[PDB]
Amino acid sequence: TINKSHDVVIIGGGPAGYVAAIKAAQLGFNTACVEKRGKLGGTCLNVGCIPSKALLNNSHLFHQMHTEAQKRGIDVNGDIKINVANFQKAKDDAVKQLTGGIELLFKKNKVTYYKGNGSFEDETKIRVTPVDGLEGTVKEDHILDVKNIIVATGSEVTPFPGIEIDEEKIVSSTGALSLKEIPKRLTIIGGGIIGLEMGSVYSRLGSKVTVVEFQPQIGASMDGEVAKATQKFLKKQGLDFKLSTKVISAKRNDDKNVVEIVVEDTKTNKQENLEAEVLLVAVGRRPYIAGLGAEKIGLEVDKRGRLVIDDQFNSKFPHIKVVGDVTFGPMLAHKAEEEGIAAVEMLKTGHGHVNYNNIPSVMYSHPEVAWVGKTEEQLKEAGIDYKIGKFPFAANSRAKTNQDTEGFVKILIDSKTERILGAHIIGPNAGEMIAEAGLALEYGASAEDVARVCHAHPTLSEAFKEANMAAYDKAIHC
Amino acid sequence: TINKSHDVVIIGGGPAGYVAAIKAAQLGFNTACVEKRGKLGGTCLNVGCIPSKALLNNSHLFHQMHTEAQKRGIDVNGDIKINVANFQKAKDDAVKQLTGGIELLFKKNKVTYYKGNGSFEDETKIRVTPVDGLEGTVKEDHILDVKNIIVATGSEVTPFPGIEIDEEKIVSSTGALSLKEIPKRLTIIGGGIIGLEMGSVYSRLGSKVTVVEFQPQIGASMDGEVAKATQKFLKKQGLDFKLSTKVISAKRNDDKNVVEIVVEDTKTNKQENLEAEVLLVAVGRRPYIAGLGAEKIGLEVDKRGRLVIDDQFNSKFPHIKVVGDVTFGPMLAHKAEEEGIAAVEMLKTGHGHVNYNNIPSVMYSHPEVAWVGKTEEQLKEAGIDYKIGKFPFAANSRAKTNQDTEGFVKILIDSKTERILGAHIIGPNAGEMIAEAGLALEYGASAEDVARVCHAHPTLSEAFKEANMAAYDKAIHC
Ligand SMILES: Cc1cc2nc3c(=O)[nH]c(=O)nc-3n(C[C@H](O)[C@H](O)[C@H](O)COP(=O)(O)OP(=O)(O)OC[C@H]3O[C@@H](n4cnc5c(N)ncnc54)[C@@H](O)[C@@H]3O)c2cc1C
Ligand SMILES: Cc1cc2nc3c(=O)[nH]c(=O)nc-3n(C[C@H](O)[C@H](O)[C@H](O)COP(=O)(O)OP(=O)(O)OC[C@H]3O[C@@H](n4cnc5c(N)ncnc54)[C@H](O)[C@@H]3O)c2cc1C
């Protein structure tokens, strides 16, 4: 029991956490960041974003060397097999450098990193419990009196009832990122972005991937047209899709080494028994309020497990702000970064805004799928009259020149104001291109305004320019 | 001779030419496009943009397979060698599809393609003479009675005086595009964008490149910092630099197949006897008015060889527009296309302007260089007080994750209004990323307006956001 005081304490060091802590230190405050696990960055830099994307880029280079190389005029005279150990080391060292860089950024901003479990004592004090391993609390058991405290605890994997996730043979997203042996068959329960990306990296490597999902279409936040097309390019890449299918059982049959799965189709209530070497339960992610002690002070949790807030990011206590994956919004690292900034700006200025309508969702498969704004379904649901204007990458100059033409840029605009309402891009660099769609939405620009922007030749950004040209008038290469 | 009448005729089928033809046709005009060579696309699709970028991308993938592959966890049990014939074929197919795509578009938009040379009879009409080995060289002469004439004759390589450009040993950009074997040495005379991209291709394939440039800075249209840093990463890639050096003489020798270059350093003048297998002569590109018959009607040409126009693109004759590389402005395909569309919509509306302050310039090397707006030196001369914002790709999440951390983003904003005056990006995807800065400059957006938009995680576009953020205030990740 050792007592210290700070202006702000951030309980959690993820995208919402470490970002809120750096911005507060830059805003004059005496900041604290309490992180439970031995590294910072949270789920995104250790179990999320950075691990999966390192795996995804390197698997695509193995895939291009196996498929595209001959056609690109490069002869690989012999075998090309993946060294799973160094494949993992390329990913681990990226995680190691980024998490080690957040600790250095804290050190430069003079944010006191408390390496222990953060819990409430009062609605003013935070008990920093020691956790096992390297640096427990800051020489055992702290209590911190704070003026403002921002709860930036994250998320955890939603478990499937009855399935024991032993991350070895029945892995979750985390188990899948560390597999030191590539499966002959990898079954995935969940058609979401996390399941689709994990399906991609291992199918490129050799796994006969199958994706079981209760919903008909995949990536369920996607535009209908984009999602149906996302099934099609992944099915050409080698992913099988068992849709409208609920999983019943899943058990390690250790005698045969095979995770004996049993599923049932929704339209026809018959059941199949499947067999996969590794099973992945990517059914979702839920909030993590455990160990924080929301029950002591009475911080409201809803039916989903999320700490509720108002538009000013605070809960029933005006000084206790909840941000990230534990609170409302799409469970995305940059959404959490925007909330970590906006919450902290509210403490120094009384102002801050996260535009929830301009939050990009990007699946980093190849082609990358990315989208901002409203989908077709949402505009027809709202009764908004809209003009569609897509442009295939097969028509784009750099896409053909780079022999990477899968996808299209789709611009949905309002028919009478002609302003961009949505932008849904299946394509190479789609996560990069949606940034252009993001900035155009923030300014409330029309399809015509970006069409009048001079885009360089040859670039993939011209597909955007001309998708917009096709929306209000006519495109040149279409 | 046969005399047919059209509303608009375009003398040229390059970027400016064919989009002007497609747009005029889309605007209802009876459009005709006269192209002397067998294909549309001009210099860009045939011997420019599309072929060099195709060689730039495939050589980069060879370069990734040869150096980065094992570190990405991909072990090749064999030998990675570049097949120059399949490499050249990949380039040719890209060019072939693209050019054929414009013919499909000309049939779709009902443009009348005349394969033959266009000339001025008088100011009111054009003559299409038959060419030579041209597949479809319009039987015998045509005399088109035209209401409006757009001159998109473009450009040609500027020959270095005293050097015999044979497309075998003393090549120009077109020569180096179709080189059947990788030379042991490649001396380039011209440190611009074209010569540097061609240096990157062959340094990546096996050639010991040496670039020679008269002035003390390479690729000069660049910012001072960008040009010092572009020279540094290219030197790092294996390209030697002979700055402040002029070529005195260069003669092909076949008693030992070597172009014996003789250079001289402009400061402390002393001769050096250089040697190479091939010699790229990429000193520049000058306007091409040959065979047009401009002089016949007295069309004003300046001392630099450009066909002079006014603000509205008209020559001294008010119905004869001149667009593209043959007239004023930077010799860029997208600049040309904008001039093509503008000259055509001026016939419909009576007004049209191209924002010359918002035209990017992309070097498609790796890392890519790309800049739009005012340079630092341009701002010191104009007496503009400006703030600098810089964010390296070493601190960017997706760049570090992809092991491609070379470069930075540099937003130049005004000190008083804080709007983005210029943006200079060295890095992976910089050519794609400069389009976001393009929207910014168009809308008069400030460094804060980009820093406030929610950029997806993990992406390279976040480095743009963080550099804008650092320009007016402070970056979160550095
Ligand atoms: C190696 C290389 C790489 C390049 N890379 C890029 C790049 O990445 N991005 C970029 O923006 N730019 C690039 N450029 C420059 C680009 O090629 C030019 O900016 C663009 O092609 C200019 O278009 P244009 O319409 O004016 O004319 P051009 O494309 O030059 O073509 C005009 C056409 O006019 C015809 N013609 C000429 N005279 C007559 C006549 N009297 N009668 C009938 N027909 C005639 C043909 O000869 C010719 O093809 C590159 C150039 C080179 C050489
Ligand atoms: C495989 C995968 C890939 C993903 N890819 C992307 C992507 O590409 N782009 C994207 O935007 N999003 C992605 N996400 C989602 C992203 O990881 C989350 O949106 C992001 O981590 C949210 O940040 P956060 O700060 O809210 O929470 P988190 O990063 O989860 O971090 C919160 C931290 O709180 C700590 N903590 C929890 N309780 C306590 C307590 N009581 N005391 C102290 N510390 C505590 C946890 O240990 C944790 O490290 C991915 C997720 C997964 C699983």
From Swiss-Prot, chains A, B:
NAD(+) binds at G190, G191, G192, I193, I194, G195, L196, E197, E213, V247, G284. This is Dihydrolipoyl dehydrogenase, mitochondrial. It catalyses: N(6)-[(R)-dihydrolipoyl]-L-lysyl-[protein] + NAD(+) = N(6)-[(R)-lipoyl]-L-lysyl-[protein] + NADH + H(+). The active site is a redox-active disulfide bond. Present with 24600 molecules/cell in log phase SD medium. Its EC number is 1.8.1.4. One of its GO terms (cellular component) is mitochondrion. It is found in: Mitochondrion matrix. PROSITE patterns: PYRIDINE_REDOX_1. Pfam families: Pyr_redox_2, Pyr_redox_dim. Gene3D superfamilies: 3.30.390.30, FAD/NAD(P)-binding domain. It comes from Saccharomyces cerevisiae (strain ATCC 204508 / S288c). The gene is LPD1. The active site is at H457 (proton acceptor). SUPFAM superfamilies: FAD/NAD(P)-binding domain (SSF51905), FAD/NAD-linked reductases, dimerisation (C-terminal) domain (SSF55424). Coiled coil: none annotated. GO terms for biological process: 2-oxoglutarate metabolic process; cellular respiration; glycine catabolic process; hydrogen peroxide metabolic process; isoleucine catabolic process; L-leucine catabolic process; L-serine biosynthetic process; pyruvate decarboxylation to acetyl-CoA. Disulfide bonds join C44-C49. Its cofactor is FAD. FAD binds at residues 35-44, 53, 118, 153-155, 325, 331-334. Belongs to the class-I pyridine nucleotide-disulfide oxidoreductase family. LPD1 is a homodimer. Eukaryotic pyruvate dehydrogenase (PDH) complexes are organized as a core consisting of the oligomeric dihydrolipoamide acetyl-transferase (E2), around which are arranged multiple copies of pyruvate dehydrogenase (E1), dihydrolipoamide dehydrogenase (E3) and protein X (E3BP) bound by non-covalent bonds. Component of the 2-oxoglutarate dehydrogenase complex (OGDC), also called alpha-ketoglutarate dehydrogenase (KGDH) complex.
